[PDB]
Amino acid sequence: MGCTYTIQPGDTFWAIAQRRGTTVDVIQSLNPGVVPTRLQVGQVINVPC
Numbered sequence: 001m002g003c004t005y006t007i008q009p010g011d012t013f014w015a016i017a018q019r020r021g022t023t024v025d026v027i028q029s030l031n032p033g034v035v036p037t038r039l040q041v042g043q044v045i046n047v048p049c
Contacts, residue, residue, distance in 0.1 A: 003049030007034075009041030022048045 005016065005027075013036070017024045028034070031045040 003047055005045055005047040007040065007043045007045055016047075020047060 003020075005020065013024045013027055016022075017027055020027075026048055030047060034040070034043070034045065
């Protein structure tokens with residue numbers, strides 16, 4: 001339940017947060033499978049709507 005976000009090559013966590021209007025903590029919390037050290041490009045994920 002909610003909205004989905006597409007992680008493209010260049011999108012930053014902080015940016016997406018301030019953009020969508022959510023907090024980085026929640027953004028990652030919703031998708032713990034992803035890490036900052038292994039930031040992949042072209043991967044869809046979940047986000048707060």
